[PDB]
Write a protein that binds this DNA or RNA. Structure first.
Ligand SMILES: [Zn+2]
Ligand SMILES: [Zn+2]
Ligand SMILES: [Zn+2]
Ligand SMILES: [Zn+2]
Lengths: 73, 79
DNA sequence: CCGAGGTCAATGACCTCG
DNA sequence: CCGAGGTCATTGACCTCG
């Protein structure tokens, strides 16, 4: 099976120029819409997985932009 | 903070309904009892419940709560 | 301090639509 | 057929209180 390149969950296809899951797809859509700026409480080095994606939103949004999620919509 | 959740292994503050559990498994057990919801597993009823994939199957997550000795009667009625 | 109770913003499964 | 868009029931961090 194909996995989401951001967190490693079961990806549901390509969303915003990246093979992501429904969780990371919705998170990346809300982040750009609200122009939200997060602050990591662990020094910006959180390893991204299914558990850490709900904890740190800074390292999650950084992981999405590192995996090529475009925001042209 | 200083305890381990008996269902998924997350950080547990103390005992809830008799068992060490996290804020996630505590509310999940309360919601299931107060609303009397019945879940249905999509696999062989052996889904793994840990820190990262506890939300995978609601059935096997509730079954582990009963297996770890969570008392359903410990859930009071809605005030 | 402990274990009940509670709220509610963020989350994510699942929807319609072009 | 996919992926844009959307809704909305669940999740879990953060509370009060005796
Ligand atoms: Zn993901
Ligand atoms: Zn982080
Ligand atoms: Zn737990
Ligand atoms: Zn299951």
């Amino acid at each position: 099976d194909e996995l989401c390149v951001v967190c490693g969950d079961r990806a549901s296809g390509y969303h915003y120029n990246a093979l992501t899951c429904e969780g990371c797809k919705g998170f990346f859509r809300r982040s750009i819409t609200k122009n939200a700026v997060y602050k990591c409480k662990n020094g910006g080095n959180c390893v991204m997985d299914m558990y850490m994606r709900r904890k740190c939103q800074e390292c999650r949004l950084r992981k999405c932009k590192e995996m090529g999620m475009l925001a042209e919509c | 903070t200083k305890h381990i959740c008996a269902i998924c292994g997350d950080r547990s503050s103390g005992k809830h309904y008799g068992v060490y559990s996290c804020e996630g498994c505590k509310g999940f057990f309360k919601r299931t009892v107060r609303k009397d919801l019945t879940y249905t597993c999509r696999d062989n009823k052996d889904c793994l419940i840990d820190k990262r994939q506890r939300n995978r199957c609601q059935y096997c997550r509730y079954q582990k709560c009963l297996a770890m000795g969570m008392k359903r009667e410990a859930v009071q009625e809605e005030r």
